[PDB]
Amino acid sequence: FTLIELMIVVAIIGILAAIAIPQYQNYVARSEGASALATINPLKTTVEESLSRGIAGSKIKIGTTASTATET
Amino acid sequence: YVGVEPDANKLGVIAVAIEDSGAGDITFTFQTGTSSPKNATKVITLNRTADGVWACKSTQDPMFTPKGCDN
């Protein structure tokens, strides 16, 4: 081993240790909103169906408790 | 006995009551457990005068009333 190789390696290390990094927060901030609406939009179909069929409001809830001929 | 039940149509209930003098009224009352919210508790009626004239009326909104009666 010599000093030339070691110095060249040290210089190349510092050279590589200079890559810039741009922002990456707005991407996730927008992806979260693009998914929230896509997930909570389809409920309007069920709401309109329940309001136009015959049953009144209030009884319309969320979860997984089966269904019947009165509550949705 | 006309061949229709008082609740044949699930949208509402029908009621007839002809008086002895011929005058009477056939009414249809919308139910709250089947009809729409706007057409809930509304009543349509067809009346027969004593002389023998048929008129009709309703209690729904103007835009929802059919093209054959008033409000």
Curated annotation (Swiss-Prot), chain A:
Principal cellular location given in the protein's record: other
The protein's assembly and partners: Interacts with itself to form a multimeric tubular filament structure with a diameter of 51 Angstroms. Interacts with PilJ. Interacts with PilS at the inner membrane. Interacts with type II secretion system (T2SS) components XcpT, XcpU and XcpW. (Microbial infection) The ssRNA phage PP7 infects P.aeruginosa O1 (PAO1) through the retractile type IV pilus (T4P). PP7 binds to T4P by interacting with a single pilin subunit PilA through the Pilus-Interacting Region (PIR) of the phage maturation protein (Mat), and is brought to the cell surface through pilus retraction powered by ATPases PilT and PilU. Then Mat enters the cell envelope, causing pilus bending and pilus detachment, which impairs cell motility and restricts the pathogen's virulence.
Modified residues (N-methylphenylalanine): 1
Protein localization: Fimbrium; Cell inner membrane; Host endoplasmic reticulum membrane
Entry remark concerning the domains of this protein: PilA subunits constituting the T4P exhibit a classical pilin fold featuring an extended N-terminal alpha-helix linked to a C-terminal globular beta-sheet-containing domain, which are packed tightly along the pilus. The N-terminal helices constitute the pilus core where they stabilize the tubular assembly via hydrophobic interactions. The alpha-helical core of the pilus is surrounded by the C-terminal globular domain of PilA that coats the outer surface of the pilus, mediating interactions with the surrounding environment.
UniProt note: phenotype after gene disruption: Mutants show a significant reduction in the efficiency of extracellular protein secretion. They are also defective in twitching motility.
Family: Belongs to the N-Me-Phe pilin family.
Outcome recorded upon mutating residue 1 to C: Loss of processing by PilD
Lineage, top ranks: Bacteria, Pseudomonadati, Pseudomonadota, Gammaproteobacteria, Pseudomonadales
Keywords of this entry: Cell inner membrane, Cell membrane, Disulfide bond, Fimbrium, Host endoplasmic reticulum, Host membrane, Membrane, Methylation, Transmembrane, Transmembrane helix
TM region positions: 1-21
Biological processes annotated in GO: cell adhesion involved in single-species biofilm formation; regulation of calcium-mediated signaling; single-species biofilm formation on inanimate substrate; type IV pilus-dependent motility
Post-translational modification remark: Methylated by prepilin peptidase PilD at the amino group of the N-terminal phenylalanine once the leader sequence is cleaved.
Protein name in the entry: Type IV major pilin protein PilA
Function: Major component of the type IV pilus (T4P) that plays a role in surface and host cell adhesion, colonization, biofilm maturation, virulence, and twitching, a form of surface-associated motility facilitated by cycles of extension, adhesion, and retraction of T4P fibers. In addition, plays a critical role in type II secretion of exoenzymes by interacting with specific components such as XcpT or XcpU. Modulates host calcium signaling through interaction with host calcium-modulating cyclophilin ligand.
One GO term describing the cellular component: host cell endoplasmic reticulum membrane
